[PDB]
UniProtKB/Swiss-Prot annotation:
Protein source organism: Enterobacteria phage T4
Impact upon substituting residue 26 to H: Facilitates transglycosylation more effectively than hydrolysis; covalently bound substrate
Consequence of changing residue 20 to E/Q: Loss of 99% of enzymatic activity
Sequence positions that bind substrate: 32, 104, 117, 132
GO biological process annotation, one example: defense response to bacterium
Name recorded for this polypeptide: Endolysin
Effect of residue 117 to F: 10-fold decrease in enzymatic activity
Reaction(s) catalysed (UniProt annotation): Hydrolysis of (1->4)-beta-linkages between N-acetylmuramic acid and N-acetyl-D-glucosamine residues in a peptidoglycan and between N-acetyl-D-glucosamine residues in chitodextrins
Documented EC number(s): 3.2.1.17
Keywords, sorted A to Z: Antimicrobial, Bacteriolytic enzyme, Cytolysis, Glycosidase, Host cell lysis by virus, Host cytoplasm, Hydrolase, Viral release from host cell
Family: Belongs to the glycosyl hydrolase 24 family.
Effect of residue 117 to I: 500-fold decrease in enzymatic activity
Chain's role: Endolysin with lysozyme activity that degrades host peptidoglycans and participates with the holin and spanin proteins in the sequential events which lead to the programmed host cell lysis releasing the mature viral particles. Once the holin has permeabilized the host cell membrane, the endolysin can reach the periplasm and break down the peptidoglycan layer.
Mutagenesis / variant outcome for changing residue 11 to A/F/H/M/N: Complete loss of enzymatic activity
Amino acid sequence: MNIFEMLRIDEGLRLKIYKDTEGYYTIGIGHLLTKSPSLNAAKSELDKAIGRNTNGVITKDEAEKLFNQDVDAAVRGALRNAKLKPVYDSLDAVRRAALINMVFQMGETGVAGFTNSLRMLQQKRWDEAAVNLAKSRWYNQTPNRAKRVITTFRTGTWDAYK
Ligand SMILES: [Cl-]
């Protein structure tokens, strides 16, 4: 298992524009387009992203190209953010993947906000960070996915994704 596969499980794949769990315009493998309610704007963000007149449909290849760039940016947000780097650097390989998952999903900024949880991870205090992580809107809105990320952090294995 790896970051791509993991993320592919959590996000799915859709070749036509769709609304995410929060009602925002998305496409591909969890590629958010816009937070605006206009389908127009979304179409526009898409065309711009793809470099072509898409009509709200893309190919598999295109989906994957966006996914790649997305995973690459999330990694980099992990290394780049000042609250993040240190935690990231203290983690094992699996757990790093758990962190990136979160960055992809909620932005660098969303994650940098889970202060207490971040310190606990950094301290390698697994059971506590897991409880703490669970007291969140994140957890309450998307409980199954959150559970997955959470066990990953708890255990440091891929069991939740098997
Ligand atoms: Cl883009």
